[PDB]
From a paper:
Like-acetylglucosaminyltransferase 1 (LARGE1) is a bifunctional glycosyltransferase (GTase) that plays a critical role in maintaining proper muscle function. The polysaccharide which LARGE1 synthesizes, termed matriglycan, is composed of xylose (Xyl) and glucuronic acid (GlcA) subunits in a linear repeating structure of [-3GlcA-β1,3-Xyl-α1-]n. LARGE1 is present in the Golgi as a type II membrane protein, composed of a transmembrane/cytosolic region, a predicted coiled-coil/stem (CC), and domains with xylosyltransferase (Xyl-T) and glucuronyltransferase (GlcA-T) catalytic activities, which are separated by a linker.
While obtaining the single-particle EM data, we also managed to crystallize the LARGE1ΔCC and to collect X-ray diffraction data, extending to 2.6 Å. For both chains (i.e., A and B), electron density was visible and hence allowed us to model residues 134 to 752. Despite the fact that we have crystallized the LARGE1ΔCC construct, the two chains in the asymmetric unit formed a parallel dimer that resembles the EM map of the LARGE1ecto. Indeed, the crystallographic dimer readily fits into the EM density map of the LARGE1ecto. Inspection of the parallel dimer interface shows an overall buried surface area of 2,589 Å2 (1,350 Å2 on chain ‘A’ and 1239 Å2 on chain ‘B’). In the active site of the Xyl-T domain, we could not detect a clear density that would indicate the presence of a divalent cation. The LARGE1 GlcA-T domain has an extra histidine (His708) that seems to participate in the binding of the Mn2+. Interestingly, the closest Xyl-T and GlcA-T sites in the context of the LARGE1 dimer are located on opposite monomers rather than on a single protomer.
Numbering used by the authors:
A (entry chain B): 134 to 279, 287 to 360, 368 to 369, 373 to 382, 392 to 712, 719 to 752
B (entry chain A): 134 to 281, 287 to 361, 368 to 369, 373 to 382, 392 to 625, 637 to 717, 720 to 752
């Protein structure tokens, strides 16, 4: 029928989070039933996958999280060759942690790929008989034939089918615990973690197992017949399946399936709401719809480790990019030694291309303090403020430096900003520190190593003020004339369309998502800063340089619609704040 | 069983060719039986689809072509408001054109998508009874029920999906039957609005016993009856069906090369030679992947977009030839602004990227205004950028006697096209083996004012904003084309006769690909002539993913491929080759 199929997965860390996304893409493509994922996760996986599934909005898919750390005390007495083995052991205790009403589940490891509809494997449960409660595929390796005890060749636990009711009725907890203790007296440690334990139980209790055909867990023989693949001539085809699912557009999987009632979690309810309230006749409909659009988000795509800073002064460089600016990553890493947060607007293919590039970069693999957040492409305009908000929400520091992927910061800018947060008393007062922005017209080989070199180059016409030839306003309030000779930080007041690059405390106002596509977004943000009486201080020894780039993908209606978005922003601001808004409209 | 299912499709033109590839993807994803396609095609479709199925190498799939142009006289007497309707009319004559041994077929239109195994529809033939020979789904529009009309029975029927019992149709003298009906109706109605469909309906009006009505769900006309829907007919609830269409558009066609699990096929001979060549290789060699990719066959889709070439009066027309990946799509409009003559492009894409490119072109006025650009899709496969396969695909399929072998990242000078034509006449390229060199420069400025004369070019060089990409002084001041000799690692951009030697397919990835090509031109005694007034400029761009590929072993293997080229050259030619080794 439309019965819901229940899938339990243990997943800890960043790699497992990626891998489970790939598994889930595989199940969804061929699925025809509702799905309920029970993710037993550590804190890292729980955060990443929680946000991921919230923003994915897959119809008819429920996801429950179970804290895996709170489970280690159940299996930590069983020694393992690899510490990660403890997570494997946790399958043994699913009967305890899963809800009591849940009668049967399919357990999968993260390196499993589906090649068919999961309803078939789920249907195999009906062929169980009597005291059969475990469904497993023979271990296709000769590990147990030549080592913990096993029944014949033994069984692989990458794919397990559990009758939870019967397992609870048989008091499975006591049984596997006794078996484990009894065998652990002789064998000192488990090599293959849960797998070992399971085989011993099935060896001791050969009535428990129902052997699944080889083809429900193809451990990489028996291409039509192969249905579930397990990684560790026909290999090239399956590697192409795996690559096909890595790169397959997750957004295509939001497809609804009738016959079955769908569930719109809570975010989908409100999205449907907002898209209904809209005026379809209005010619800026795409702008309003992308004001409310929800993108798949995969936080912390790569391994991440932040080292707690002594001071409460640490600063994160925050930026966003699409694939055409991948070239900037390493450059920034050479110039900025502190933590970095990046929102990357990619397609799934581009996400995996980025994966390969980053793993093949010495600088990127040596940096563990850069969080790379993937916002998957959707719709027609570059959601610059969505991206900025995603990057700036997920930082590990009290202060952040809001930059572009296209600037290279001054060498030593990071430590200088920390000294500045101390010097300008950013801990006790509401201030926005400005980093003066300059530009170059072609890539250069010697980067200025001092403000004196900066000034010499500027006097030769090889460096210029940022956007100097198009919008001299926007950075003119910085006053580069007095910055030139200044030695003390100095205060500047707000002017129309002013758009500096600032370092601020992390809980500052976010960007307004109504301004999709290229427009007056940063200007609106700076106005938001100025109403809340953020003080604009220019730093006498800081600077950043914009690298030249080709334009990225100008209809008259688009100009008109931006103008209407600007108007509606000023009107929501007049209502939002009050008399304070007036000094900005006269601009 | 392993019984073969026969599918006949009428396809003319470029749009139809893309659409039929989509149809075939959807059939292959669900098929479990061998397949035999009967493609009734105009010349364009025959060229396109012949190459596509040759390179696709789908197991257990046979493809026969029937020249549709030689069939026009069968139906041209039936006037239509659309000339394209003529190809529709050709369904009426399948009993004549399909082979005599062929008992039954499924006829499909190009805009059909399958959602299930085609053997189910094929089995529906067994429910036919008595004098029934035509299987059709009711027409879901109200076209025949009112003024929005040819005679029809009730709703009428949709002709996008038809089941034909060819034996009984031949015994019934079906040709005279529908012809009689067409003429009788044609005396009253002056022309057909919907072509073959009308005539079919007229027959069913006159002969209501012929039809077996298929359920609506074998031909869902979209312009309700979701699990039960099996075949979709294209023309809120839309998003589900467009997502199926997107899912088949984006599916990796190469995955459909999987073997038929129950039935042994023979994969013609293109797989026979691929298998031979991949067996003869030495797997112990550390450049095995390069050698394996020397012979890989990539799925190829020539003329992915509408193409229309205007025959040149004189025999001097030149084609700009180039290759690109998705990351350089931005360049197309620029090249079209600089080169008004014909263009042939090899695009190394995935299926998703191919459909994204379709969208991009559909939204570009400069690209839609140009009908003289051929877009050839070489679908990605393997590990290295098959640059010379790409160049060869692009340069073989041109419409002109001469070709300009360029790179996607240069913009040619304005008016280069006419200059090259005038040059082929003055340098007598019709009677002699010559390679005209187009001097290539480069800029590091991203906001460049493109020089509109050689004098402006030279000033920009004198101010340091342009630089070379020989005696530049001889070119600087030259006014006559001049001859230059070959030198080590020589690599100019040349305009040559269309039958010059092709690129050597062993050079996968970036290395001595062009060096070897130019070296071939020099052994076959082409003259290198520099044009004094031609030039093209390299525009700065973000790097591609070549930047990732270029492992130590990859450097070693590229140098090894150069060595092996020189060695095969010494064997093929002789002492004339030695002067290139001494370099
Ligand atoms: C996770 O993958 C990264 C590279 O993608 C690797 O450096 C790291 O060691 C992996 N973590 C493991 C194997 O625990
Ligand atoms: C072919 O399809 C394209 C869509 O890309 C359309 O713009 C064009 O008008 C079509 N031409 C014909 C003759 O159907
Ligand atoms: Mn910029
Ligand atoms: Mn280039």
């Amino acid at each position: 029928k439309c019965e819901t199929i229940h899938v339990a997965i243990v997943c800890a860390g960043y790699n497992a989070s990626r891998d489970v996304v790939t598994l889930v893409k595989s199940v969804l493509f061929h699925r025809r039933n509702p799905l309920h994922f029970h993710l037993i996760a550590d804190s890292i996986a729980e955060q990443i996958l929680a946000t991921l599934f919230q923003t994915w909005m897959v119809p008819a898919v429920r996801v429950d999280f179970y804290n895996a750390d709170e489970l280690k005390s159940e299996v930590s007495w069983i020694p393992n060759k690899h510490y990660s083995g403890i997570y494997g052991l946790m399958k043994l205790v699913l009967t305890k942690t899963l809800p009591a009403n849940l009668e049967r589940v399919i357990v999968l490891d993260t390196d499993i790929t589906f090649a068919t509809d999961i309803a078939e494997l789920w249907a195999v449960f009906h062929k169980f008989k009597g005291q059969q409660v475990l469904g497993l595929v023979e271990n296709q390796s000769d590990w147990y034939l030549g080592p913990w005890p096993a029944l014949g060749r033994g069984y692989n636990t990458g794919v397990i089918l559990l009758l939870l009711d019967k397992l609870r009725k048989m008091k499975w907890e006591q049984m596997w615990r006794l078996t484990a203790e009894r065998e652990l007296m002789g064998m000192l440690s488990t090599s293959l973690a849960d797998q070992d334990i399971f085989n011993a139980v099935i060896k001791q209790n050969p009535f428990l197992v129902y052997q699944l055909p080889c083809f429900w867990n193809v451990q990489l023989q028996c291409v039509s017949d192969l249905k579930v693949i397990h990684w560790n001539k026909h290999v090239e085809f399956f590697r192409n399946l795996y690559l096909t699912f890595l790169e397959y557009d997750g957004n295509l999987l939001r497809r609804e399936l009738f016959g079955c009632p769908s569930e719109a979690d809570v975010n989908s309810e409100n999205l449907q709401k907002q898209l209904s309230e809209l005026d379809e006749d209005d010619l800026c409909y795409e702008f309003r719809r992308e004001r409310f659009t929800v993108h798949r988000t995969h936080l912390y795509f790569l391994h991440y480790e932040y080292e707690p800073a002594a001071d409460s002064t640490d600063v994160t460089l925050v930026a966003q990019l699409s694939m055409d600016r991948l070239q900037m990553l390493e450059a920034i890493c050479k110039h900025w030694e502190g933590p970095i947060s990046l929102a990357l607007y990619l397609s799934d293919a581009e996400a995996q291309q980025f994966l390969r590039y980053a793993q093949g970069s010495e600088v990127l693999m040596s940096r563990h303090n850069v969080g790379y957040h993937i916002v998957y492409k959707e719709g027609q305009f570059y959601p610059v403020n969505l991206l900025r908000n995603v990057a700036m929400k997920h930082i590990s520091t009290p202060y952040m430096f809001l930059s572009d992927i296209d600037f290279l910061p001054m060498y030593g800018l990071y430590e200088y900003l920390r000294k500045s947060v101390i010097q300008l008393d950013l801990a006790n007062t509401k201030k926005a520190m400005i980093v003066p922005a300059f530009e170059t017209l072609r890539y250069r080989l010697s980067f200025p190593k001092s403000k004196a070199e900066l000034l010499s180059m500027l006097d030769m016409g090889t460096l210029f003020t940022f956007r100097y030839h198009v919008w001299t306003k926007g950075h003119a309030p910085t006053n580069f004339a007095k910055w030139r000779t200044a030695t003390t930080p100095y205060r500047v007041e707000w002017e129309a369309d002013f758009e500096p690059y600032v370092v601020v405390r992390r809980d500052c106002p976010e960007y307004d998502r109504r301004f999709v596509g290229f427009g007056w977004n940063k200007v609106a943000h700076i106005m938001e800063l100025d109403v809340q009486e953020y003080e604009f201080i220019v730093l006498p020894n800081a600077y950043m340089i914009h690298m030249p780039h080709a334009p990225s993908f100008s209809n008259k209606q688009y100009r008109i619609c931006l103008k209407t978005l600007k108007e509606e922003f000023q009107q929501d601001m007049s209502r939002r704040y009050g008399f304070a808004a007036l000094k900005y409209l006269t601009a």
